[PDB]
Every structure is written in C-alpha cells, then in structure tokens.
Amino acid sequence: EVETFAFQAEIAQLMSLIINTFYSNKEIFLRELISNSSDALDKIRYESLTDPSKLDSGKELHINLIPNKQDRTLTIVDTGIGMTKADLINNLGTIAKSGTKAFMEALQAGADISMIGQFGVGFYSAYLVAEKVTVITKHNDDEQYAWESSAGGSFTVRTDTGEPMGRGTKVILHLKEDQTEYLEERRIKEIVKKHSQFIGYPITLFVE
C-alpha cells in the first residue's frame, strides 16, 4: 500500500523556491546531505555508548556516495540512526515549518540559498539538482520505509520491499537532465574536499 500526503503550505512554498529560483552554486546540496548523514551517525554512536545492542543492526559507521550514469542517480548512503514512520510523516514536518519561515524571512533580508542548513531544512537543497528524491530509511525501533517526492505539493510513504539495509538512510537523487556533472568522479571529489573534508566518518566515493 502506497500512502500519499500533502506537504504543509510552507514546505511546498520552500520546494517551489528551491526548484525555480536562479542559483548557480547548486554544489552545496552535497554538504547538506553529508551533514544530515554525519548527525545521524553521531546519534547512533552516542546511543550505543549506554546501550551496545543498538549496533546489532550494524557496527560500521560510514557514508557511501554512489553515482549511476545509466539511471542518472546519485545515492548517499549512511549507517546512521535512520528515521521512523513518525519522523517521515509528522515529527520532521513541524520542525521544517518553523525552519522554512525563518529561512524565507532571511532570504527576503538578503541571505543566500547556501545558508539553508542553519534553518534545519538543508535536506530540501536536494531539489537544486534532483527532479525526484527517494529516501529509504531503517531505524532500530521501526520497519524499512521509502519516502518519495517530485515536489508538486505531495509525498508518498510505503513499506520498502527492496534490499534490507540493517540500519541507516539511502537518499536517491534522480538528477535533472542538466545536472549530470554531479555523476562525475572528479566533480564529487572536488565538492567533498571543499565542503566536507573534516566529517568524522569515512566517506567512500564509489566508481562506475
């Protein structure tokens, strides 16, 4: 069963702004994805200190960057804490609503799109380069879910039947036709070196 949900007006407004505003410094999407992955890894690492059984779903704490030219997709995989069904549908929406208002107020005041991360809505920068974003996630206390949106005011949530992840999050970016540069090995390496060189987890860039 595939469940369809409407984004709250502010999120839909944020998504429309990211997709249609003229902004050339699109590369910042990768640092935002890597930062969310890093925070998710920090959370599971901290929780494992008081409860070691939280690592039974996987001991390895890492980030994988997987480009695919045939499918025109860039996948960001982490072995972080993951997200529950409540996180995907309710919990993060509330946070993102206030985050959007403050960000859109800051943009009106002269701030730029690269500052999106400071408002906790950095995830939505994925729409600078992607026409569709798929989020496969597995949290210890819940099942494996697939969140998906091509914007247009709606998102879907379904129980994932694909390859079991153990624990973590997979962000599949179905890239826009003119954004294929983010599939090039030399381009990804350059972005990682410039914006994410001090991330405290191994970042493995897969080759084709």
Ligand X SMILES: Cc1c2c(n3c1CCN(Cc1ccco1)c1cc(C(N)=O)c(Cl)cc1-3)CC(C)(C)CC2=O
Chain residues binding ligand X by CB under 6 A are 36-37, 40, 78, 80, 83, 87-88, 91-92, 95-96, 120-121, 123, 135, 147, 169, 171
Q: Which of residues 140 and 177 has its CB atom nearest to ligand X in the complex?
A: 140
**Spatial CA neighbour of 28 closest among 128, 165, 170, 148:** 128
Nearest distance from C-beta of residue 69 to ligand X, angstroms: 23
> How many whole angstroms separate alpha carbon 72 and alpha carbon 151?
18
Residue number of the CB atom closest to ligand X:
40
Using the minimum distance from each CB to ligand X, give the nearer residue, 24 or 80: 80
What secondary structure does DSSP assign to 69-80, as a single string? TTTTEEEEEE-S
Spatial distance between the Cα atoms of 150 and 174, rounded to a whole number of angstroms = 9
Tell me how far apart the alpha carbons of residues 166 and 57 are, in angstroms, rounded to a whole number.
5
Cα(108)–Cα(15) distance, rounded to whole angstroms?
16
Concatenate the DSSP letters of all residues of 102-125 into one string. Answer: HHHHHHHTT--GGGGGGGT-GGGG
112 is in an annotated binding site: no
Q: Which is nearer to ligand X, 36 or 196 (CB)?
A: 36
Instruction: State the Cα–Cα distance between residues 27 and 93, nearest whole angstrom.
Output: 25
The nearest distance, CB 56 to ligand X, in angstroms, is: 19
Q: In this complex, which beta carbon is closest to ligand X, that of residue 70 or of residue 154?
A: 154
For residues 80 and 94, give the distance between their C-alpha atoms in angstroms, rounded to a whole number.
22
For residues 117 and 31, give the distance between their C-alpha atoms in angstroms, rounded to a whole number.
9
Residue whose CB is less far from ligand X, 163 or 177: 163
Q: Nearest distance from residue 80's CB to ligand X, in Å?
A: 5
Q: 78 among the known binding-site residues?
A: yes
Least distance between ligand X and beta carbon 20 (Å): 19
Q: Is 39 annotated as a binding residue?
A: no
Q: Write the CA distances from 182 to 9, 177, 193, integer angstroms.
A: 30, 11, 14
Name the minimum Å distance from CB 175 to ligand X: 16
CB atoms within 10 A of CB 123: 20
Does 22 appear as a known binding residue? no
Numbered residues of the known binding site: 36, 78, 97, 123
Numbered residues of the known binding site for ATP: 36, 78, 97, 123
